[PDB]
């Protein structure tokens, strides 16, 4: 897949666990840990686009589950995906 | 300032230098280096919003200088800033 380098399921599971523990700065801290484990490829801009689409949806609303499933099906990390995700 | 933790001028100067050297994956590699130097606070979502606004503008067009000046004046890192930046 074109986004395999982004480790996005790993990011998802990190954010869910971090929020379950009620920790501060989960987006930042998960991003950082995944960088430490899997390197700079997880911070490319296409990864950023997917994450922003997913996290805006998960911030501005609820059901993390539809936020993930919808982003995963319709977002390829193109900058244009922000217009609809 | 509310975005001082994001080290965004540092990011800007990194991206400009990296692109001047014609290197691969400058967005990713600058993000990663700034994380290594200044920690997880540089990866908060408000930082992500500012960077995405700036970099989309700098990708979809040119004059990096107006992309920076406009984002810096009108983007506070609110998720809603994506609608207009
Ligand atoms: Na990112
Ligand atoms: Na980021
Ligand atoms: Zn892993
Ligand atoms: Zn520094």
Numbering used by the authors:
A (entry chain A), B (entry chain A): 5 to 89
The article reads:
The Mu8.1 conotoxin from Conus mucronatus is the founding member of the newly identified saposin-like conotoxin class of conotoxins and has been shown to target Cav2.3, a voltage-gated calcium channel. Two recently published crystal structures of C. mucronatus Mu8.1 revealed an all-helical molecule forming a homodimer, with a common dimer interface observed in two different crystal conditions. Each protomer in the dimer comprises five disulfide bonds connecting the four α-helices and shows structural similarity to saposin-like proteins as well as con-ikot-ikot from C. striatus. Five disulfide bonds contribute to the overall rigidity of the toxin by forming both interdomain and intradomain connections, referred to by the roman numerals I–V. The first domain is stabilized by two disulfide bonds formed by Cys18–Cys34 (I) and Cys22–Cys30 (II), both connecting α1 and α2.
Here, we present a high-resolution crystal structure of Mu8.1 obtained from a new crystal condition in the high-symmetry space group I4222 at 1.67 Å resolution. The structure reveals a dimer interface equivalent to that previously observed in Mu8.1; however, in the present crystal structure it is formed between two symmetry-related molecules. The high-resolution structure of Mu8.1 obtained in this work allowed us to identify a tightly coordinated hydrogen-bond network around Lys55. The network of water molecules revealed at 1.67 Å resolution surrounds a potential functional residue, Lys55, and may contribute to the unusually low pK a value (8.16) predicted for Lys55 by PROPKA. The relatively low side-chain pK a could imply that Lys55 is uncharged in the dimer, thus rationalizing how it can be accommodated at the hydrophobic dimer interface. Overall, we propose that the combination of this side-chain stacking and the observed hydrogen-bonding network creates a hydrophobic microenvironment surrounding Lys55 that results in a lowering of the pK a of its ɛ-amino group.
